[PDB]
What does this fold into?
Amino acid sequence: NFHDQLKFAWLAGFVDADGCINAQIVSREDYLLKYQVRVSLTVFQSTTQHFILLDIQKILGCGTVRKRNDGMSEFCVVGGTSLQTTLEKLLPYLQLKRAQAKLVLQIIKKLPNTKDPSVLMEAALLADKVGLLTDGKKRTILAENVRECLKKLGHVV
Amino acid sequence: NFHDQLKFAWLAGFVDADGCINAQIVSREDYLLKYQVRVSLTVFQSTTQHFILLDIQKILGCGTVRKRNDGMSEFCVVGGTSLQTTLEKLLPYLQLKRAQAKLVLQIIKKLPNTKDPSVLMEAALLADKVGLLTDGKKRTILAENVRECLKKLGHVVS
DNA sequence: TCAGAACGTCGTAC
DNA sequence: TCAGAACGTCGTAC
DNA sequence: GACGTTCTGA
DNA sequence: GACGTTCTGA
Ligand SMILES: [Mn+2]
Ligand SMILES: [Mn+2]
Ligand SMILES: [Mn+2]
It folds into this structure.
């Protein structure tokens, strides 16, 4: 479709401006390795224009829409399966966050093998590099925290 | 052609998200009617990605790029001639600010006749309606201020 | 007299 | 054990 | 925008 | 994001 491509180009613009493509290290207490590398695309817009997020969901065919308790609404695609598809669709039109996407795509390749501490460690190191591209200030959970935990768990990386 | 349409669709997204399509009432002390109705599209981005605003300028073929003194940069197209061409390219793809664009396009029609006080008043009333679509809290120059000034100046309007 | 170029900063929607 | 769905809020880039 | 956290269930 | 103001020149 030249029509679907018109949609994605518009969405890339929106994402480039009011979106977030991210990899984070999230604490998971019942993981044997204690950490997940979570990947996501998020789109933010005031709840006053909530509908646009649903329109984005319709365009992509996946993802969730929620309302935050502060007047904001969010669209999120989280997880390797749905996200890889989403990013491949936007990849040709992204101008500001293409690096974030290329990196996340590198992480998604490793995700099915994150039970191996070495692979997890690589995913985590890649997450850190995505953090360096975002506006974020509160990034506390880092690759070093994974490496110190893994070592404490008796693993070798 | 289609490549251009992809560029415009993307720009519309970027405008829908981090842009501003607006109409304002600006005081002009040396105007006969004391006021102008200024129409504009603006794109905002941190100076860290200053390059993208230059990219937009290249895409549209007009408009200015400046750096503000707070780490922000802006791309701006101000004025009827450049703006109308600009809005018409984005208009099919705008999804959040199409109303602002359509209203500004109504205002652009009137601008070559804003020497007439009643036409200025129409554009000023229309600008007021664009201000209702924006997120601004700071707008203090409204249609009512033009109406009172024009009356003071000896003109007849309503 | 016009009016864009360029500017400086508040409030909140990212 | 996994990990998305849904959530709550800080700092600033709109 | 971009984090960290809690809920839910495969 | 979206204002109101100052510089510049047609
Ligand atoms: Mn932005
Ligand atoms: Mn926005
Ligand atoms: Mn924004």
